[PDB]
């Protein structure tokens, strides 16, 4: 059971190479080609969601899930999922 106030974000790799994932000031695990990895943070707020060649100012609201599509050299897409 996740604690109330926490937030989730999916680092989706839409490219064909490993991407370096890091949200805000936290270094996260790399994501495999055409793969994805779910991450979570206790403290909600606005963070810089860097995913390899992409970097989006993804705001993480409390008690909410996010899916971030990172497409190197293409167009990224953030999806909110309360």
Curated annotation (Swiss-Prot):
Location in the cell: Periplasm
Recorded superkingdom: Bacteria
Function: Together with AlgI and AlgJ, forms an inner membrane complex which probably interacts with the alginate polymerization-transport complex and adds acetyl groups at the O-2 and O-3 positions of mannuronate residues. Acetylation of alginate is important for the architecture of biofilms and increases resistance to opsonic killing in the host.
Family: Belongs to the AlgF family.
Protein name: Alginate biosynthesis protein AlgF
UniProt organism field: Pseudomonas aeruginosa (strain ATCC 15692 / DSM 22644 / CIP 104116 / JCM 14847 / LMG 12228 / 1C / PRS 101 / PAO1)
Protein encoded by which gene: algF
Residues of the full protein shown: 37 to 118 of 216
